[PDB]
Amino acid sequence: SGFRKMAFPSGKVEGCMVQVTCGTTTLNGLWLDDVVYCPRHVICTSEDMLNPNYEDLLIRKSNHNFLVQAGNVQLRVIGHSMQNCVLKLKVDTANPKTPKYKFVRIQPGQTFSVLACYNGSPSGVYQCAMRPNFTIKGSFLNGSCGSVGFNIDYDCVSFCYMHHMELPTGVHAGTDLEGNFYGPFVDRQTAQAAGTDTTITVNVLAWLYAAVINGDRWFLNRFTTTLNDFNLVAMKYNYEPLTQDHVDILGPLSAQTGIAVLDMCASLKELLQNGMNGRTILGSALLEDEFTPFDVVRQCSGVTF
Amino acid sequence: SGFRKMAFPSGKVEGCMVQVTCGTTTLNGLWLDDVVYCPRHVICTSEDMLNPNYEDLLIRKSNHNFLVQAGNVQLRVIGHSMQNCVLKLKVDTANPKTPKYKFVRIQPGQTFSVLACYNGSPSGVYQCAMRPNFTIKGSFLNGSCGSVGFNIDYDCVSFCYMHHMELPTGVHAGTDLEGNFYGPFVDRQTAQAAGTDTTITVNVLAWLYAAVINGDRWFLNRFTTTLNDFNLVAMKYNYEPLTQDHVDILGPLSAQTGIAVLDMCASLKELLQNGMNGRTILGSALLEDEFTPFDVVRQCSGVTF
Ligand SMILES: CC(C)(C)[C@H](NC(=O)C(F)(F)F)C(=O)N1CC2(C[C@H]1C(=O)N[C@H](C#N)C[C@@H]1CCNC1=O)SCCS2
Ligand SMILES: CC(C)(C)[C@H](NC(=O)C(F)(F)F)C(=O)N1CC2(C[C@H]1C(=O)N[C@H](C#N)C[C@@H]1CCNC1=O)SCCS2
Questions:
Q1: Where are the domains positioned within chain B?
Q2: Pairing outcome for strands B148-152 and B111-118
Q3: Which candidate from B8, B12, B172 shows the least CB-CB separation from A2?
Q4: 3-state secondary structure (DSSP) of residue B263
Q5: What does CATH list as the number for A15-99?
Q6: How far apart are the CA of B215 and the nearest CA of chain A, in angstroms?
Q7: B110, B116, B119, B122 alpha-carbon torsion, rounded to 10°
Q8: How far away, in angstroms, is A49 Cα from ligand 1 center?
Q9: Mutate to test the pocket of ligand 2, among B161, B189, B190 (most ligand atoms within 8 A of CB)
Q10: Is the domain A198-301 a CATH 3.30.559.30 member?
């Protein structure tokens, strides 16, 4: 029993973390085979933060200008190129700890773990969601860029996120591992703000199912609802529309608990309209939306890697 | 910016996890040098759960009766003994991935990361606190026992917890790595219940300091308080007494923010007496008490390992 915001084991990613330095700027890099991937703003100068000329900045660099260190070992850079907003530094040594891996581009609503790093060394690991507005609610300081987000399937690490930016109100923006930003963000210091965020409805429902599995059942009412009538209420409280794909994705949890998805929707409708009246669900006074249906099953069934 | 329930990187502990099997019972073990540590109730039978005769059960075991596997590799057991509530299985191979480590017994209020494992493989990592009533609010299923809790200092893993039991209301009990339970719990199936829990006051204050560091400042009032008058209010709301050692431990955060500890105490007093009125602090509608002062500094200053 119990339900926790649980991250993936980070060991496979820890063995890929390095530091990249240009001048006085040090960030993290990700070392896979004989390539180090890092944010291209490592080559920025204090002068030209507002709108860096990345191509000119990179042209003026030689391989020797990139100081790449893995632990206490310097890795010699033998080539370099820019792919969208990331640098690819070819090094003369393949990472012997390279896991089986994939580069993936996740969808809003999906979750992943972040290994927060400084100077190529890990600080901690936590679980995030790609918000509907393509930000993430992370915890990042100066020097954290190049930290990555990931999922693990079995033995395979799917890298989905590399950190680049902090946006107003303390939320975070970054790219996939091909250097393409999630959302309408750019890697320069310019007026940027996320669109209005929304609550990930299918995830709230998955978390309510987790509550039921854990015996926290007080919010279950006697009613049902149509999908359309539910979504009319969801819209008012800034919840995303629930789709039939979402309903089908909740199938395993609905089957395990014997609660039809639309019946859970009726209970969620009542929570939205009436509040929780000082009660908690799984220890929280707010409805949680950063657990996917798959996260709930993984945690409640003990899936390992 | 940002503040997350952040766990330690788990790689060093992942390389120590094995599975131990007796009959049809498989749990996790921790492999350090040439010893595997695991919960002794691995040798239990379905018959004698209410009050197992551990010494008789172990006498009847030979080394060959313990099936210890590291990944897909069987480790041959060459000796075995019982230390309080843990077994020590001597194996013929020293773990080549053994980190620098220490066995420590933590105090209530302190925090650690748990690497939840099944069949010797990790499922996920999360951050816990040793509650004042010597339970932890974990997430554990059948087969999770032998999972361990830990802190990392620099390169050194301090193991502090190994999981044994789930108590009524879905909270968890276990031992240090010398097999001594935290709290008044025993490893048998008998009526056990935790004493009343309390809120870890020094941790709530540390988390309020984290809020201020992140610019979430609305709860700061214009008042101050004496330590004694604060503790009279704390007692009413089931908060632990704040000691002078706690005040001094908050020194770094008080210095960074320029807010005296007793001034923060006045703001916390007002929160306890008046509630939050639907507002949140660092995204939470409840006051959080599972971040220590050291956790806050680590996360807000980017300490690495
Ligand atoms: C938050 C800022 C105001 C400084 C800025 N943000 C924006 O300009 C906004 F998005 F608001 F438009 C921003 O993030 N920058 C500015 C550049 C680098 C990058 C950056 O510091 N990235 C860090 C890494 N390493 C991680 C940051 C540091 C704080 N916490 C994080 O997560 S962009 C390329 C030229 S300098
Ligand atoms: C929860 C129980 C009612 C089953 C029981 N608890 C109690 O008896 C109480 F504490 F309430 F008094 C308990 O935990 N037991 C019974 C024994 C083993 C141990 C146990 O199953 N430990 C698991 C491991 N592996 C981890 C558990 C499984 C569920 N989630 C967990 O965390 S004690 C030694 C003889 S059988």
A1: 1-14+100-197, 15-99, 198-301
A2: antiparallel
A3: B172
A4: helix
A5: 2.40.10.10
A6: 9
A7: -120
A8: 9
A9: B189
A10: no
